[PDB]
Amino acid sequence: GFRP
Amino acid sequence: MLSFQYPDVYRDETAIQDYHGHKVCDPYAWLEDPDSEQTKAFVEAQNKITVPFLEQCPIRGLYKERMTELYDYPKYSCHFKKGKRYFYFYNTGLQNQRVLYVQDSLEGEARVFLDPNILSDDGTVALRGYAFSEDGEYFAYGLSASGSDWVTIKFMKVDGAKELPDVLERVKFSCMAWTHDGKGMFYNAYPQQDGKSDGTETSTNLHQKLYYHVLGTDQSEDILCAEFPDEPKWMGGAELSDDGRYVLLSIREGCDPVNRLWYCDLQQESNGITGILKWVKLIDNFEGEYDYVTNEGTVFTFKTNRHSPNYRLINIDFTDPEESKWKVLVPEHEKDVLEWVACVRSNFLVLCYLHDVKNTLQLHDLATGALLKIFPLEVGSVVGYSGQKKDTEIFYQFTSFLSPGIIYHCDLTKEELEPRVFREVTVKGIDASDYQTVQIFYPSKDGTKIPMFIVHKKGIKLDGSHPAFLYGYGGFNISITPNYSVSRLIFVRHMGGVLAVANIRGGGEYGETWHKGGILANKQNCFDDFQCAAEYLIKEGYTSPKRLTINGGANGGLLVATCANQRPDLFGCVIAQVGVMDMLKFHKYTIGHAWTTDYGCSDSKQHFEWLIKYSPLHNVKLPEADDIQYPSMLLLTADHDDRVVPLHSLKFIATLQYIVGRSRKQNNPLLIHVDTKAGHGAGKPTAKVIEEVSDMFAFIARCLNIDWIP
16 A cells, blocks of 8 residues: 555 | 734745636645744744633533543453464554454464554654464564555554564555465555655655565565556555465546555466566456456455445456356345455355444355345444455344444354354443434435434533534545444533434445445535535534534545535534545645546536535635524634645635634634644544543533533
8 A cells, every 4th residue: 555 | 802913924926827717815834844944933923822821711621531431441452363373453442553463373362463663753653554374384474654645555564573683765645465374475666756755845746656575675676466547546465365266456546435446366476476467458448447356266255336326246257257147146236336355265255235324234155145144233334354265153243323343253164054153342421322413315416315423421401502513525435324423422411412413425324326326527516515415414403603613624624624615604612623625626636636537627627616615724714694604614624634635725715714703793712733743633643632522522612611520
């Protein structure tokens, strides 16, 4: 998970 | 009320950049260096005026004390089985970090297995990701320091909770998958880089690699199993199939729900894992999502969005791989989003659906896909689940706006499936019966109907007199579903507030078409949807503009900051957490390059034309009308936020204070707080969570002059  | 002065901040007027013929000035570009004395001094000067402002009122003390009171309740994760033992996470109430517990049986005595609290003096070392071996005898776990995305993987023998020498460094955005022979584990790492790697640096993350670690060896010996040197943004996560026969590789580029799917039959490896694997490229494009559910031999069950924006279940036979031959096990629903699927007790499937922003949980037959049982829930969310293929039971956790929640257990060996309450907690002092949750659908600018949840005290007069807290995100296919927030409930009970959550476009509430509705060229739809939510709450008499606070985090920080620029007349107060404020430069730092699937990239002229129109940093503008000023604004960030680099907020507040704060019609404060030893938010210790929410509602109370209701 690398979403802002 | 403004008994301070904004710090003098140097403007670099020479920092002019050409974007496809458009000249952009970036006078605070020097704030992009987090390690400089200039940046540190700027941060210090800002914290020096914010903290005294937030703490001047006894209301913060009253909120913190009440927050500490009502947040002090037992918190459990679902029980889950690995090997012959059960595991679960537990917080007595106020522990900085939840503790992983082990018990040898469902009725047996529980003991501490991993306590992260003892690894740090301020609870800022947190667990981030973990993987048990197939037989449950060995344990791998990620640790993050001070909220950074960077991870150190360590290893444990479960029996006796024994520490092992194995340490894995440079781990970030990584998978964790043991081969079923227990020999080792797949993970991701990044190559060495110059400068620091602690979460304070801004250096972009590229060339992520898949490694295999043989237990009992040095990391230096680790096997390189996949790399994409021609495609530096590609990220390959590995997992083992249920039978342990295939390594499945999900390759992503960006944040769209899409992936390539390669596989490796481990039986077909000549001499075990010794180098780059014999990958078979089943799906070799980014046109759809393929999320492994289960397999029976070569017949693989995937959750997909290929030609199905609301998602569905397909069977792909590896020996008959053509799309025309794929079998649709559980067809796409007309409206309901299939959120996730799990395989349990060999031949059951647990499907979680989102119907109008509420969860339903169902049991299906693997062979046919036929519905067998609905698990009865109230209106709310499923936020936890346990039950893999070999397991003969399920655990699932339910939450909602007014309920801390419930963990249910269901024995799937029984002919008639009776799910019972396994765990329940009630927060004393918060009478859930005093409040109600309504869902409405308001029309947006273009006529589209948007869902919004409203939580208020029962029996209130809709005369527009109540202070309101409206939350939104709107992006990245993320669904903002009902959740238990004590912090937001104190606002209702002790500050007389109305709470609101708008499911604006960009999210995944109504599938991929909902996601597409608020991205790229359509990004403005998000802001339009959110502004229309505000207007609805005003028109219906829930609140007034001077009593309304809007809030969002990260992409939601971008949301509320843009809405502040575009409609300052509409809000009394704005709290933007860890926001993406520089839409022109975002892609340059850490993992920012992955967000271009939602936002676009300023490298392209088309995309730049979208971005300049709403970019918070580049749209700070004194309101034309004399009777209108900017709302009260508080930006919250931290010095180890390497997800959204803090420079975003630093440049933004400097711009706000210079352009708007200098003007004589502005009396509403424009403030930033930069925390230490914290990051984007994940893993943040309880103590810091309480500090943050106290700051937030102290800001609201002071700016709106709200009396405490004991």
